[PDB]
Design an enzyme around this catalytic site. Structure first.
Site: not given
Ligand SMILES: Nc1nc2c(ncn2[C@@H]2O[C@H](COP(=O)(O)OP(=O)(O)OP(=O)(O)O)[C@@H](O)[C@H]2O)c(=O)[nH]1
Ligand SMILES: [Mg+2]
Lengths: 415, 177, 18, 180
Positions: D69-71, D73-74
């Site tokens: 849920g990384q920014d 990685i979104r």
């Protein structure tokens, strides 16, 4: 401190490249070919090139040049040693060094290149040890690399314990055109094919002059090797202490020691050749070979290369013993003799034509090279005394060794 | 060609994945600009077979500076591979991490380098020593912040003479710059 | 047989030197 | 053509299926995947990249691809939309401020013309604290009933306990497989 190890070809195409540091752009290889062409066409061609601030130091292989780009003040000797190790590994893995295997064995070649050197610093170079971790047809790396003994894999078992040695002699003679020998050096070569069970610690013992003097027996036939270069398995400290040659033989054939001492004896073969070359009319080759070696020794496959004229045609040979043939590819008279007993004397009388029109440029006088190879003959007189094969398990070894005498840099300067 | 290769690489069959990896490696070695398919090969990276993992790592290293943005999808894979029981896999992962010329990737590789610095396997120790020198050459400040100089100094005074020599060479290279 | 000189067995050590 | 081999394979089980693992960081995605695959609550660092695993249950290989849920990685979730048959949404009921972000991310991911055959799979993660809502309040807030042509099913799973995982797996199998 190589930046990228690459393999080129005869047409300038890079067969394979393997960057090690990435500090040099991969496009610099394109200028290597024009630079090499300019250097060769101007006589300034050298194995160590320089594309501005990046140096291209590499050697020429059988079919491609292993050029390794570098930019910093890297050790040229280290790069040359790495290239030689890579060539040896390729020869051990691939029976041929040509473009046929470069484009066909890339799967294992890339893995070997990646594993051998990391960041420009090689770590493993033993083909036998490397064959247990990288294969073209993977388990954990063997403990031999991690352990001190990286040239003898543990656990080797064989039905018999036979080690074959090869005392190969290299008779190099540099005879000037005046008839005197300038460079007469004989380099010994102790190549052994060790095939035993376990990891035996060989204790090589020979009748060395230094060893005999130290033991007090400096009065018999002792080999005076000016330079003795032991292999990696041979312990340098043991040899330096009391001339103790103790080392673990590897699994296979390898060069353990290589003696190199000067020779002050008369040549084993004396060649008396004359050149009765008429001015654009004919030529005479009164070549007489006298064998100064012992009569009990026979020089198998004697090949005395006599450089004949390059433009000579319709030649006739009047010899005594041995087949003499002129090879237009080499432009010389090949004095091929199958068996040459010691003390034999072969006389030859060559006669070949010459064109009326003189040549545009001089061709030079290539030296006359003899290819004598007399087995079971030790010119230096060095004889193996003992070979201490010791194993923890305990077994009776059956070491073997043979002495082979051949002609090395035995070239004769022409008049 | 390109579409067929991408479809083969995005398949669930290992027999086709290995052939696609071999074809991609040959095209790059043959002189084909295969950097456009870097994101496609990113998904087919976590493979149990070591034959395809090495080719993927080599392609990523050769396609790291060309597409640094697309290389952000490999930090998790490298972290996972840095703990494999096989020393060869860990050494390969360490070598690939240091070979990636990515400014935003070497920052997160400090933890795996610190973990592998004290690795019991001599091959792992040598790989960590080489990776530390590579990171210092890429970023001296990052290496200094990570405090790898103390670990490198203690490497020379330990066992594994090959690892000790590798650590000494890395320290000399770091001091050279 | 073998070209280049027949192979000969080697000793174990200098028995005359103890 | 002959389909005797296919019938023989299907007589003992041939369908495997696929699945996706997406959601916010620290939402129990990695722990949920570890519990589904192994059966233990494994503590892992935040998913910088992605995790790919498979689950063998009911003769179907439920391959789950965990997504962080990384920014940064979104926007990388579109890479897994190719050759993807399933999708599992993990909500974070313990983060009131992140609930809106998770709903917006789900709406953005559900507004793709390529991801249409992937049925909705809402997983109620972090079902161990009193602040967690029920199986309808979260759905009502997210408006799961407003997804036209979408088969949504909300299942509450406790990361520490593991209850409700079997029910969710059975529901997914029933939605994917339409046979006896
Ligand atoms: N104690 C406890 N923590 C939970 C529970 N459910 C979720 N969590 C938290 O959720 C996190 C789950 O992270 P991971 O399992 O590693 O994977 P993730 O959910 O995808 O998180 P990211 O990797 O950051 O994307 C844990 O660190 C926990 O702090 C639970 O039931 N009990
Ligand atoms: Mg996770």
């Amino acid at each position: 401190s190589a930046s990228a190890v690459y393999v080129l070809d005869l047409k300038g195409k890079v067969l394979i490249c393997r960057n090690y540091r990435g500090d040099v752009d991969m496009s610099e290889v394109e200028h290597f070919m024009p630079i090499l062409m300019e250097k060769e066409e101007e006589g300034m061609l050298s194995p160590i090139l320089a594309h501005g601030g990046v140096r291209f130091m590499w050697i020429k292989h059988n079919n491609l040049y292993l050029v390794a780009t570098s930019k910093k003040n890297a050790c040229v000797s280290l790069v040359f040693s790495f290239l030689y190790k890579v060539v040896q590994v390729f020869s051990e893995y691939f029976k041929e060094l040509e473009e046929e295997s470069i484009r066909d064995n890339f799967v294992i070649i890339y893995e070997l290149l990646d594993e051998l050197m990391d960041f420009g610093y090689p770590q493993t170079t033993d083909s036998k040890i490397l064959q247990e971790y990288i294969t073209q047809e993977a388990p954990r790396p063997p403990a031999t690399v991690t352990n001190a003994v990286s040239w003898r894999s543990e656990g080797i078992k064989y039905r018999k314990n036979e080690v074959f040695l090869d005392v190969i002699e290299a008779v190099n003679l540099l005879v000037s055109a005046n008839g005197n020998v300038l460079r007469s050096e004989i380099v010994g070569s102790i190549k052994m094919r060790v095939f035993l069970s376990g990891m035996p610690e060989l204790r090589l013992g020979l009748n060395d002059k230094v060893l005999f003097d130290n033991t007090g027996r400096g009065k018999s036939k002792s080999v005076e090797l000016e330079d003795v270069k032991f292999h990696q398995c041979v312990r340098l400290s043991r040899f330096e202490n009391d001339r103790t040659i103790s080392f673990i033989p590897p699994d296979g054939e390898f060069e353990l020691m290589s003696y190199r001492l000067n020779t002050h004896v008369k040549p084993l073969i004396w060649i008396e050749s004359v050149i009765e070359k008429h001015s654009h009319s004919r030529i005479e080759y009164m070549v007489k070979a006298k064998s100064q070696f012992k009569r009990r020794s026979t020089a198998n496959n004697v090949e005395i290369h006599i450089p004949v004229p390059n433009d000579a045609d319709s030649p006739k040979f009047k010899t005594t013993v041995g087949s003499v043939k002129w090879v237009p590819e080499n432009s010389e008279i090949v004095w091929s003799v199958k068996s040459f007993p010691g003390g034999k004397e072969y006389l030859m009388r060559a006669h070949f034509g010459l064109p009326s029109v003189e040549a545009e440029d001089k061709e030079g006088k290539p030296p006359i090279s003899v290819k004598f190879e007399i087995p079971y003959f030790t010119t230096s007189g060095i004889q193996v005394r003992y070979l201490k094969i010791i194993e923890k398990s305990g077994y009776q070894a059956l070491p073997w060794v043979r002495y082979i005498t051949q002609n090395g840099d035995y070239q004769l300067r022409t008049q | 060609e390109i579409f067929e290769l991408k479809a083969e690489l995005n398949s669930d069959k290992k027999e086709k994945k290995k052939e696609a990896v071999k074809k991609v490696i040959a095209s790059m070695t043959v002189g084909k600009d295969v950097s456009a398919l870097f994101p496609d090969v990113v998904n087919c990276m976590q493979t149990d077979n070591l034959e395809l993992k090495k080719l993927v790592y080599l392609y990523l290293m050769n396609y790291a500076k060309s597409q640094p943005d697309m290389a952000i999808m490999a930090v998790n894979t490298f972290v996972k591979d840095c703990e494999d029981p096989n020393p060869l896999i860990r050494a390969l992962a360490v070598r690939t991490m240091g070979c990636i010329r990515v400014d935003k990737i070497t920052e997160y590789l400090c933890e795996p380098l610190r973990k592998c610095l004290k690795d019991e396997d001599p091959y792992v120790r040598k790989t960590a020593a080489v990776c530390v020198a590579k990171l210092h050459d890429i970023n001296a400040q990052l290496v200094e912040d990570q405090g790898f100089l103390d670990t490198l100094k203690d490497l020379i005074s330990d066992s594994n003479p090959m690892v000790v020599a590798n650590a000494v060479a890395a320290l000399s290279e770091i001091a050279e710059s | 047989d073998r070209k280049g000189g027949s192979y000969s067995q080697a000793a174990g050590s200098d028995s005359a030197q103890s | 053509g002959n389909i005797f081999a296919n019938l023989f394979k299907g007589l003992f089980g041939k369908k495997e299926m696929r699945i996706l693992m997406v959601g916010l960081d620290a939402a129990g995605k990695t722990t949920i995947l570890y519990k589904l695959k192994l059966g233990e609550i494994v503590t892992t660092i935040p998913t910088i990249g992605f995790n790919v695993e498979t689950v063998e249950y009911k003769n179907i290989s439920f391959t789950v691809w965990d997504v962080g849920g990384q920014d940064k990685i979104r926007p990388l979730w579109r890479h897994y939309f190719q050759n993807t048959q399933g999708l599992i949404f993990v909500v974070d009921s313990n983060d009131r401020e992140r609930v809106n972000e998770a709903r917006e991310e789900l709406m953005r991911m559900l507004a793709e013309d390529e991801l249409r055959d992937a049925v909705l799979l809402v997983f109620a993660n972090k079902q161990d604290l009193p602040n967690a809502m029920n199986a309808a309040e979260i759905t009502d807030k997210l408006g799961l009933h407003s997804l036209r042509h979408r088969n949504w099913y909300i299942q509450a799973t406790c990361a520490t306990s593991g209850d409700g995982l079997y029910e969710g797996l059975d529901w997914l199998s029933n939605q994917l497989r339409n046979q006896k």
